[PDB]
Structures are given as structure tokens and as C-alpha cells.
């Protein structure tokens, strides 16, 4: 034994336990989701209100990469920021050499390879975040989710954090009860609901909802934060559904 004490060591079953322990930190984080819609993507996240002293609207968690990609994550927040900074360098260098803004699948692999590299050596620690990200490129909308092992796939909808089971089930319903499509505006409302539903498993504290989206028609393919009236509306849609 002692196989779990060092990153990059295979156990006798062929597992990297340090990566599996990184997942535990992710499973201990706040719930975050992504929903792919007809011409875009929506991202939402639960921000726990630790105290009344937190300034509302002011500790933003969703992050833009370039101008067309949104990223949200659950787990160790600083690890997520580190990963987005790297993502921004990778997007900048791609656009520098190739002119066109980085395609979402290309961007996903850039993050994938970087996260995977942190499972190759004992001199570094795996990332303690699962990251949901995506946006619009020249081939349409794309939504990805990336784990601490470096593993990622494309998704119709995705969820991570403490309320991931609840949110998955909610996402599975949307996929079945809308086999032809979901509009960006619908998806914003649905995102609000699913976060409110997933908040059951973090009930001791009350929370702040945060949403963003990129849609070819609603935002011109750029990533924007859902603010003001449209935010309030989706909050109302969500509040009516929990009764």
C-alpha cells in the first residue's frame, strides 16, 4: 500500500488515487450547471451566502475566455481561476497565429491536455475542480465538462458540485421532453429552476443565483452575464416552481 500518497502512481487496480481524491474536493463544492440550447449555451451556478456581510452581485464566479467562451466550475475556486488563466493564454496564442477565435472543441482539448499533464508527475497536484464551459463558434454551440483526470466530453446538459445528482435528473427530463430543441430564453429559465432544485442539498445557507449565456441570436455569439430584468424574471420562474 501507500499507492495513494503520490500523484501519478498507478495502484494495483490501475487507478490514480490522488485524482480520485481531487474528485472529492469537486463533489464538496457548490452546484454549477451548463445547458446547451438551439443556437447557444447557458451557464448557471449556486453562490452560497456565507454571511449577510458578503456584498451581493460582487463575488462573480462565472468567467469569460476570449469573448465567446464561458467557464464555470465547482471545487477549489483558485484552481478554477488558474485553469481559466491558462485557458486565456491558450485562446490568445491560437488567435494570434491563426487569426480566427479558438473553436470550442479546440479550446476543450487545450484545457484537457493541461489538466491531464497535472496527473503525470508527483511534483504537482491534480486540479481540484470540474469545469463546465462552452460557447458559439463557426460550427454552432458546444458545451463541455472537464474532470480532474483531464477527461472531457461534449454534453447536451451538464452538472457538478454537491447537487449534481438532482441537477442531472432535471437535465435528463429537459432532454426527453424537448427532443427537437430548447430556446436560449427557455434555457435561462430552466437553468434558474434546476439550480433552485439542486440547492436542496445545501439548505443550511441561503444563496445567490448567477447565470450567463452565449447565443447566436440573443447575444450575437458573445458571452454575456444575465443581468437586471431578465435575471429577475428567471428567478421568479424558479420560485413559482418550488411551490
Amino acid at each position: 500500500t501507500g499507492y495513494d500518497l503520490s500523484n501519478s502512481v498507478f495502484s494495483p487496480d490501475g487507478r490514480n488515487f490522488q485524482v480520485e481524491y481531487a474528485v472529492k474536493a469537486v463533489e464538496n463544492g457548490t452546484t454549477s450547471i451548463g445547458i446547451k440550447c438551439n443556437d447557444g449555451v447557458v451557464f448557471a451556478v449556486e453562490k452560497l451566502i456565507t454571511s449577510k456581510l458578503l456584498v451581493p452581485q460582487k463575488n462573480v464566479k462565472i468567467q469569460v475566455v476570449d469573448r465567446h467562451i464561458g467557464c464555470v466550475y465547482s471545487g477549489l475556486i483558485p484552481d478554477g481561476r488558474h485553469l481559466v488563466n491558462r485557458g486565456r493564454e491558450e485562446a490568445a496564442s491560437f488567435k494570434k497565429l491563426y487569426k480566427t477565435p479558438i473553436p470550442i472543441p479546440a479550446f476543450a482539448d487545450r484545457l484537457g491536455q493541461y489538466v491531464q499533464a497535472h496527473t503525470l508527475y508527483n511534483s504537482v497536484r491534480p486540479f481540484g475542480v470540474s469545469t463546465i464551459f462552452g460557447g458559439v463558434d463557426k460550427n454552432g454551440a458546444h458545451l463541455y465538462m472537464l474532470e480532474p483526470s483531464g477527461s472531457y466530453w461534449g454534453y447536451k446538459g451538464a452538472a457538478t458540485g454537491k447537487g449534481r445528482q438532482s441537477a442531472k435528473a432535471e437535465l435528463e427530463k429537459l432532454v426527453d421532453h424537448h427532443p427537437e430543441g430548447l430556446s436560449a430564453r427557455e434555457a435561462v429559465k430552466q437553468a434558474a429552476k434546476i439550480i433552485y432544485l439542486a440547492h436542496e442539498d445545501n439548505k443550511e445557507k441561503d444563496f445567490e443565483l448567477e447565470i450567463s449565456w452565449c447565443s447566436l441570436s440573443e447575444t450575437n455569439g458573445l458571452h454575456k452575464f444575465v443581468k437586471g430584468d431578465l435575471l429577475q424574471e428567471a428567478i421568479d420562474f424558479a420560485q413559482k416552481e418550488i411551490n
Binding site: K96, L97, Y98, K99, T100, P103, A106, D109
Partner: protein
């Protein structure tokens, strides 16, 4: 050297003479100045033969690696890679490159990259020492959305005049046609184009 690239309704055509000189000596009279950097992204080269071959080979490498990872690159992307090499190494390069390619979304596109490494998207482009003598002719005779046969004639008549006046240009006129249909190489001999 006389090189040009012309967009038309079905795509783009590149044209060039076949002469390369060492002073007044014709070192090669059947040179191929039209080079492939991707299936339907080609370039015409002018300036230092060593520099433009080196650059072209590096771009072909970058686009082959781009393709493996991200699929077919745009013509704009190919021009951007050329530009990067020409701009960052302007002190050590003497390269004048025209990039021409065909997309299905974007159709035929032409980008000229002159000495300093700037980029310019154009309906058509001319370059090389022999190009100076056909600025007037090309400006007067180029129309947008010509047919394949009109475009072949425009290029043939243009390079015929460049060859006539420029001692550094000569030999055969080579052309490469880039469309949805594929890639077609054309060649025209002195006896055809001289008497136009």
C-alpha cells in the same frame, strides 16, 4: 518574376511565369512558382527563392498540424501563418507572397503579403518585378465574377505582357485553378501567348 491570383465566380485562379535568373543568366527556365500549402490553399512566391521555399515549407507544416487537430483551415488562417513568419522575420527575409484558396463558405479568396509582412485581402493581386508593367492593364480589364474561361484569358493576357517587357520573367505560363470541382493545373507555351 510575374505572379498573380484572381478570384472569379466559381473560386480562384493562380498564375505565374517560369523564369528564375542569376543576374542575366536564366538558371531555370521551367520553374514552378505555384506551391501547395494545403489541398485547396496555394501560394505564388516572389523574392528570395531560399526564403520563400523555407516559409512555404513551414506553413505547409503548420497547416498539416492544424488540420490534424482542428480540421480544414480557412484561407484567412493560412495567410495569417504566412504573415506571422514574414512580419516577425522582416529583417532577415525578402519574400513577397500571394496566398489564394477555396472554401465552400467563403469561396475564392486572395491575400497579398508584401515585403514588410502586412496583409491585404483583395479581389485579385499581382506581384514580382514583372507586375509593374501590368498595373494599368489589370486595373482596366479586371471585373468581378468572371467565368473560368474569362479569368484564364485575363491572367494569360496579363502575364503575357509582363513577360514581354520584364527580362526577369519568361518561359511557360503556369496556372492553378481552385474550385469546388477540385484542383486543375494549366500550362501555356510561348507560341500560344506571345502572339496575343
Amino acid at each position: 518574376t510575374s505572379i498573380m491570383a484572381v478570384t472569379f465566380k466559381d473560386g480562384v485562379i493562380l498564375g505565374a511565369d517560369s523564369r528564375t535568373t542569376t543576374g542575366a543568366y536564366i538558371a531555370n527556365r521551367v520553374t514552378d512558382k505555384l506551391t501547395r500549402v494545403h489541398d485547396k490553399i496555394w501560394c505564388c512566391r516572389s523574392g528570395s527563392a531560399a526564403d520563400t521555399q523555407a516559409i512555404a515549407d513551414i506553413v505547409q507544416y503548420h497547416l498539416e498540424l492544424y488540420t490534424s487537430q482542428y480540421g480544414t483551415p480557412s484561407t484567412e488562417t493560412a495567410a495569417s501563418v504566412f504573415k506571422e513568419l514574414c512580419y516577425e522575420n522582416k529583417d532577415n527575409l525578402t519574400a513577397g507572397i500571394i496566398v489564394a484558396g477555396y472554401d465552400d463558405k467563403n469561396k475564392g479568396e486572395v491575400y497579398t503579403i508584401p515585403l514588410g509582412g502586412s496583409v491585404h485581402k483583395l479581389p485579385y493581386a499581382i506581384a514580382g518585378s514583372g507586375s509593374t508593367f501590368i498595373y494599368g492593364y489589370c486595373d482596366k480589364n479586371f471585373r468581378e465574377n468572371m467565368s473560368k474561361e474569362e479569368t484564364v484569358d485575363f491572367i494569360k493576357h496579363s502575364l503575357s505582357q509582363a513577360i514581354k517587357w520584364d527580362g526577369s520573367s519568361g518561359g511557360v505560363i503556369r496556372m492553378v485553378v481552385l474550385t469546388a470541382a477540385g484542383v486543375e493545373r494549366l500550362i501555356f507555351y510561348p507560341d500560344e501567348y506571345e502572339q496575343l
